[PDB]
Design a protein around this ligand. Structure first.
Ligand SMILES: *C(/C=C\C/C=C\CCCCC)=C\C(=O)C/C=C\CCCC(=O)O
Ligand SMILES: *C(/C=C\C/C=C\CCCCC)=C\C(=O)C/C=C\CCCC(=O)O
Lengths: 263, 274
């Protein structure tokens, strides 16, 4: 019992570290100033973004020459590109969750299709503070006020998440906590169209225990942390559906053929 | 065993289960008996169509009272005004319930109201779970029963108000919770702290902190074979939000299709910029 819980806890942690480049500990260190010795390039306005490209050579999303002429759009484009990377990082992590690869292939896909956003938002918080967000592997920091400062719906998107990031991080969880947490979200037995809910649930349950214990040791001081963390899941749901809203709101823009398919 | 510290938590539990019973006429226990047939005095008149809908008023005093001129021309509407007045009495009860929550009235008055503001529908739909089974829901304080099918037809929008409700009720009722559990859970929902505009959020959380602690011991004690019932119930809080919103969405649509339908004042300040 209290044996396995601490075993599965370390595994997930050890795995999460081996799947996510920029950890919560890292990103945290940076933002503050603490030992890393190489401050980030601050995108605070236009000339900053402009200079940013050729410095943080995040010239990944930036390239696709001829669709590189309108900040707000070239940014959101980039957000998506890195979002696709995350998904691969997540899917990989998923498969280290004890039992996950043993499920019906169909349900794995399903659990993943419905869990990446909630997971993306959760981790994103790790890289943002009340003032801004860490971009490009930690190299940059795009101020928060610059984001609200975007043309159309292009300036609403990031405002919510900031609002959500502030509360979430107010719980002061670290990578060892988040690792378990994230697996719980993945093993969500309510994802639409599943086929065999029992296994999933039997797994999430084992996960929920591991997490509850993880919280009591790593946080003796904080009462009912486990409960507060679970409630946050509601914030993710709302947040995610909402995001999926403007995604359709934005479908009145950008007005390559292969570019689209990749997304 | 349960020593010193835990002892205080059982009290809070009993204190609330007690206000709950005193605040709600139709507990879940009574609702179950009525629905499961362990009765020859508690059997409800079933409504699955106009036939019985007609004999509805001519068979059961309607605690589903549709007031605006006793009747109209639109049944679905007729139904809806009922579901409307009823909802109001619940907000009324729930409010009398909240007051009993240790500390709730010792908070700033503005905050008290915003807690109720957002907490009311979330609580209304939890309670509503108690009155439902896959085939329908009780009405007129148990005296009646409306089948899921009749509701699902009604009309254009109106045939879509209750489905999300039945959908969650089935999943929710599955936790097999009883009034004593619900009473603590209901208190947690009110004392959130993530409610829009709470002036002083902190004291609100010390309250929920204790309620959550109560709910955790209660569930432990009342369901020794329920692995992680605590967490599973907390997760159910999202389904609640979706229900609420998805409903408000629905409401606004009705606010145009039906230029003549009256919405209860109170019911309106709940949604006001909700
Ligand atoms: C913003 C950019 C990056 C977020 C991705 C990962 C952060 C975690 C890093 C930890 C090391 C993107 C979003 O906020 C929204 C994401 C997806 C929605 C778009 C869906 C699509 O493009 O198909
Ligand atoms: C209620 C639909 C039917 C009522 C069911 C049972 C009545 C018997 C109770 C015995 C104690 C649907 C809702 O309650 C609607 C919720 C809130 C109304 C506010 C305005 C709105 O959102 O429509």
């Amino acid at each position: 019992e209290s044996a396995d819980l601490r075993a599965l806890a370390k595994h997930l942690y050890d795995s999460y570290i081996k799947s996510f480049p920029l950890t919560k500990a890292k990103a945290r260190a940076i933002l503050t100033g603490k030992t890393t010795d190489k401050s980030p390039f601050v995108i605070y306005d236009m000339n900053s973004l402009m200079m940013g490209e050729d410095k943080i050579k995040f010239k990944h999303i930036t390239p696709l020459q001829e669709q590189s002429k309108e900040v707000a759009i070239r940014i959101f484009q980039g957000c998506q590109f890195r979002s696709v990377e995350a998904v691969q990082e997540i899917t990989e992590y998923a498969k280290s969750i004890p039992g996950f690869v043993n499920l019906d292939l169909n349900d794995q896909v399903t659990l993943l299709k419905y869990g990446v956003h909630e997971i993306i938002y959760t981790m994103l918080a790790s890289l943002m503070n009340k003032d801004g967000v860490l971009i490009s592997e930690g190299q940059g920091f795009m101020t928060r006020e610059f984001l609200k400062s975007l043309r159309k719906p292009f300036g609403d998107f990031m405002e919510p998440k900031f609002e959500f990031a502030v509360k979430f991080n107010a719980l002061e969880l670290d990578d060892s906590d988040l690792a378990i947490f994230i697996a719980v979200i993945i093993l969500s037995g309510d994802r639409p169209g599943l086929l065999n809910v029992k296994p999933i649930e039997d797994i999430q349950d084992n996960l929920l225990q591991a997490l509850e214990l993880q919280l009591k040791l790593n946080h003796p001081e904080s009462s009912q942390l486990f409960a507060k963390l679970l409630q946050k899941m509601t914030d993710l749901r709302q947040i995610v559906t909402e995001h999926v809203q403007l995604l359709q709101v934005i479908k009145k823009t950008e007005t390559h053929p292969l570019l689209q398919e990749i997304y």
